[PDB]
Amino acid sequence: SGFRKMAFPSGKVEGCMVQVTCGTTTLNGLWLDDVVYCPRHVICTSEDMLNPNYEDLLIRKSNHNFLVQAGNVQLRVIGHSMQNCVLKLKVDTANPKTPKYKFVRIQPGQTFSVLACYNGSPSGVYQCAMRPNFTIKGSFLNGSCGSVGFNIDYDCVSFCYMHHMELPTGVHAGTDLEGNFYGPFVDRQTAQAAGTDTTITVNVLAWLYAAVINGDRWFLNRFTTTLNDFNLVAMKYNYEPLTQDHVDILGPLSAQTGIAVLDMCASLKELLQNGMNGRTILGSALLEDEFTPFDVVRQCSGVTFQ
Amino acid sequence: SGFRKMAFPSGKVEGCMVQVTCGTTTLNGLWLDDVVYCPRHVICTSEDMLNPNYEDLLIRKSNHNFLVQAGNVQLRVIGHSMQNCVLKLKVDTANPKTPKYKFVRIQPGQTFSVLACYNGSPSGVYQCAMRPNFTIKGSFLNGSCGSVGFNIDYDCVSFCYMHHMELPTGVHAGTDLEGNFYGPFVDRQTAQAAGTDTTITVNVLAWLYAAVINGDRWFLNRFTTTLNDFNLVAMKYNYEPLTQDHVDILGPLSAQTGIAVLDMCASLKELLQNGMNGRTILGSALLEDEFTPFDVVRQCSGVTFQ
Ligand SMILES: *[C@@](O)(c1nc2cc(Br)ccc2s1)[C@H](C[C@@H]1CCNC1=O)NC(=O)[C@@H]1[C@@H]2[C@H](CN1C(=O)[C@H](NC(=O)C(F)(F)F)C(C)(C)C)C2(C)C
Ligand SMILES: *[C@@](O)(c1nc2cc(Br)ccc2s1)[C@H](C[C@@H]1CCNC1=O)NC(=O)[C@@H]1[C@@H]2[C@H](CN1C(=O)[C@H](NC(=O)C(F)(F)F)C(C)(C)C)C2(C)C
């Protein structure tokens, strides 16, 4: 029993982190096979960053201008190219610790683990959700750029996020590993703002199921609802719509607990209209939306990796 | 910016996890140098666990009754001894992935990362504290015993916790790596209840400092207090007493923010006497007590390892 915000074990990713330096700018890079991926603004100085012409900056660069360090191993760079907001440095050694991997673009609502790094070294690991406004509520300082987010499926690492920047309310934005931003952000130091965020409904429902599994049942009521009536209430509380796909994905938890998804929605509806009355659910005094249905299953069933 | 419950990178510990099997009982073991450490109740069947005579269970066994697996490979057990509530198996092969390490016995209020494991494989990583009542608020299922808790400082892993059992209300109990239980617990399936828990005051103050560093300053009030007067309020709210050692440990955060420790105590006092009135601090609707002063500085200054 117990329910915690749980990250994937970080070992397979730790063996892929390197330091990439160009001039006086250092950030993190990801070393997979014979390619090092990092944010393209490794080629900027803090003056350039205010308004960079990345193509113009890149023309003036050559292989030897890119210092790549993997622990104390200096890698020889033998090629470079830009792809969207990411640089790809070809190196002359394949990373012997490359795991099975793929690049994925995640959707809002989906969770992943971040391995926050400085100077090519791990600081820590924590779980994040891609918010509906395409930000993440991370913990990042200067130098964290190039840290990655990922999921593990048995032995396979799915990389979904590379860190680029922080937005006004101390939330974070970045790209997939093909260098395309999540959200309408750009890699420039100019005023930008996240849109209105909303609560990830399917996730809150998952977490209510985790609470039931743990014997925290006080919020179960005697009502049911319809998807359409539920969505009316959701939208007035700035919750995402619940779709049939969400219902389908909640099926394992539904079947495990014997609680119809629509009955749980009716319980959530009451919680939204009446508040929590200072009570807690799984230790929290707010409704938690950064656990996916899969996260709850993995945690409650003790799924392992590696 | 941002402030998250951050675990240590787990790669160093992932390389030490093995499975120990005695008869039909399998649990996790930790393989450091030529020794494997695991809960002594690996020598129990489900029937033995009501009131095991560990001496009698052990005295029958020989080296050969212990199966140690790392991946596919069997390690040859060439010695065994029981120390308190842990078994130590000497194997004929030193772990090639052994990190620099020490064993430490932590104090209530100190935090650590747990690498939850099943069948000798990692399931995930999360941060916990040693509660004042010597329990931890974990996430553990059947098969988790032998999972360990740790801190890293630079390249050195300090192991502090090995998982043994779950108490009522879904909280957890275990030993140091010398096999000595934290708190008054015993490794038998018998009526055991944790003492009333209290709130780690010094940690709440650290997190309030974290909040200020991140711009969340609404709770800074217009008062100060004395240690004596504050401690009267803490006692009333089942908070631990704050000592002068705690005030000293908060020195760095105090000096960084220009906010005297006693002024922060006074702000906390107000929070305790008035409640938070639905407000949040760092996204939490409750006062968080599972970040140490060191945790805050580590996170806010981006300390790395490895
Ligand atoms: C990152 O680690 C990087 N640092 C540098 C330093 C140099 Br000289 C070159 C390139 C990079 S990339 C940081 C990470 C962030 C610092 C604080 N917390 C973080 O998550 N990224 C940045 O500094 C990016 C970077 C430049 C500006 N910026 C920002 O994050 C910020 N945002 C914005 O200007 C705005 F769009 F408003 F949101 C900044 C510094 C927080 C004001 C670019 C986006 C390329
Ligand atoms: C652990 O993984 C172990 N499982 C086994 C199985 C066998 Br056949 C032998 C030895 C072990 S050690 C679990 C972990 C816990 C299960 C639920 N969540 C957990 O964290 N440990 C236990 O089963 C321990 C173990 C036996 C009983 N027990 C308990 O955790 C609880 N004991 C209590 O009665 C109490 F005192 F409350 F703490 C139990 C099973 C949850 C009722 C011993 C203490 C040796």
Instruction: Locate A221 and state its tokens.
Output: 């009521």
Q: Which of A274, A111, A289 is nearest to A197 (CA)?
A: A289
A126/B14 CB distance under 8 A: no
In a domain? residue A277: yes
| B 202-221: CB under 8 A from A | 214-215
Same structural domain for residues B296 and B203? yes
Is residue B173 within 8 Å of residue B185, measured between CB atoms? yes
- B contacts of A121 (beta carbons < 8 Å): 304-306
Distance B166 CA to ligand 2 centre (A): 6
Same structural domain for residues A147 and A8? yes
Same structural domain for residues B94 and B138? no
Give catalytic status of residue B64 as yes or no. no
Phi-psi group of A245: left, alpha or beta (phi > 0 → left; psi -120 to 50 → alpha; rest → beta): alpha
Identify the three-state secondary structure at position B90. strand
Q: Kindly compute the dihedral angle of the four CA atoms of residues A227, A228, A234, A236, in this order, to the nearest 10 degrees.
A: -170
Smallest CA–CA distance, residue B79 to chain A, in Å, is 29
- B contacts of A303 (beta carbons < 8 Å): 123
φ, ψ of residue B245 in degrees (nearest 5): -60, -40
Q: How far apart are CA A111 and CA A270, in angstroms?
A: 26
Half-sphere exposure of A189 (CA within 13 A, CB side): 9
Ligand nearest to the CA of B85: 2
Instruction: Locate B224 and state its tokens.
Output: 């100060």
Same structural domain for residues A158 and A222? no
In sequence order, which residues have a C-beta less than 8 Å from that of residue A82 and are 6 or more positions away? A40, A54, A55, A58, A88, A179
Smallest CA–CA distance, residue A36 to chain B, in Å, is 20
Quick one: which H or E segment has residue B265?
helix B261-274
Q: How many CB pairs under 8 A join A and B?
A: 162
Sequence length of chain B is 306
User: Is A25 within 8 Å of chain B by CB?
Assistant: no
Domain of A166? 1-14+100-197
Q: How far apart are CA A259 and CA A265, in angstroms?
A: 10
- B contacts of A165 (beta carbons < 8 Å): none
- A contacts of B3 (beta carbons < 8 Å): 139
A14/B306 CB distance under 8 A: yes
- B contacts of A126 (beta carbons < 8 Å): 4-7
Is residue B14 within 8 Å of residue A12, measured between CB atoms? no
Is residue B150 within 8 Å of residue B136, measured between CB atoms? no
CATH of the domain at B238: 1.10.1840.10
Same structural domain for residues B104 and B191? yes
In a domain? residue B306: no
Resolution in Å equals 1.8
Q: Is the CB of B40 under 6 A from ligand 2?
A: no
Distance B189 CA to ligand 2 centre (A): 7
In a domain? residue B5: yes
Angle at A7 between CA A4 and CA A13, to 5 degrees: 170
Q: How far apart are CA B296 and CA B281, in angstroms?
A: 15
Q: Is the CB of A192 under 6 A from ligand 1?
A: yes
A123/B305 CB distance under 8 A: yes
Same structural domain for residues B163 and B63? no
φ, ψ of residue B98 in degrees (nearest 5): -60, 125
Q: How far apart are CA A153 and CA A157, in angstroms?
A: 6
B11, B123, B286: residue with CB nearest A302? B123
Same structural domain for residues B190 and B238? no
Smallest CA–CA distance, residue A66 to chain B, in Å, is 23
Q: Is the CB of A41 under 6 A from ligand 1?
A: yes
Same structural domain for residues B116 and B4? yes
Distances (CA, A) of B123 to A155, A203, A283, B278: 12, 20, 22, 35
Domain boundary among A34, A67, A99: A99
Q: How far apart are CA B137 and CA B132, in angstroms?
A: 12
Distance B199 CA to ligand 2 centre (A): 26
For B145-181, letters b (16+ CB in 10 Å) and e give bbbbbbbbeeeebbbbbbbbbbbeebbbbbbbbebeb
In a domain? residue B81: yes
| B 116-145: CB under 8 A from A | 116-119, 121-126, 128, 137-144
In a domain? residue B54: yes
Written in H, E and C, the secondary structure of chain A is: CCCCCCECCCHHHHCCEEEEEECCEEEEEEEECCEEEEEHHHHCCCCHHHCCCHHHHHHCCCHHHEEEEECCEEECEEEEEEECCEEEEEECCCCCCCCEEEECCCCCCCEEEEEEEECCEEEEEEEEECCCCCCECCCCCCCCCCCEEEEEECCEEEEEEEEEEEECCCEEEEECCCCCECCCCCCCCCCCCCCCCCECHHHHHHHHHHHHHCCCCCCCCCCCCCHHHHHHHHHHCCECCCCHHHHHHCHHHHHHHCCCHHHHHHHHHHHHHHCCCCCCECCECCCCCCCCHHHHHHHHHCCCCC
Identify the three-state secondary structure at position B239. strand
- Given the residues A16, A85, A128, A145, the one annotated as active site: A145
In a domain? residue A61: yes
B10/A125 CB distance under 8 A: yes
In a domain? residue B170: yes
In a domain? residue A306: no
Smallest CA–CA distance, residue B150 to chain A, in Å, is 13
Alpha carbon distance, N-terminus to C-terminus of chain B: 23
Is residue B305 within 8 Å of residue B7, measured between CB atoms? no
The atom of ligand 1 lying closest to the CA of B1 is 18
Distances (CA, A) of B35 to A179, B73, B88: 46, 16, 6
Domain boundary among B197, B212, B242: B197
Strand segments (E) across B120-261: 121-129, 148-153, 156-167, 171-175
Q: Which of B196, B103, B109, B91 is nearest to B150 (CA)?
A: B103
Same structural domain for residues B86 and B111? no
Domain tally, chain A: 3
Is residue A12 within 8 Å of residue A115, measured between CB atoms? no
Q: How far apart are CA B20 and CA A240, in angstroms?
A: 46
- The whole-angstrom distance between residue B256's C-alpha and the CA centroid of its chain comes to 28
Domain boundary among B197, B223, B239: B197
User: Is B286 within 8 Å of chain A by CB?
Assistant: yes
Single-letter code of the amino acid located at A5: K
B126/A286 CB distance under 8 A: no
Same structural domain for residues A117 and A148? yes
Same structural domain for residues A249 and A120? no
Q: Is the CB of B165 under 6 A from ligand 2?
A: yes
CATH of the domain at B138: 2.40.10.10
Is residue B182 within 8 Å of residue B271, measured between CB atoms? no
φ, ψ of residue A158 in degrees (nearest 5): -100, 105
Q: Which of A139, A153, A163 best tests the B interface by mutation, with the highest count of B CBs <10 A?
A: A139
Quick one: which H or E segment has residue B254?
helix B251-257
Q: How far apart are CA A185 and CA A173, in angstroms?
A: 7
Same structural domain for residues B296 and B202? yes
Q: Which of A189, A43, A187, A164 is nearest to A114 (CA)?
A: A164
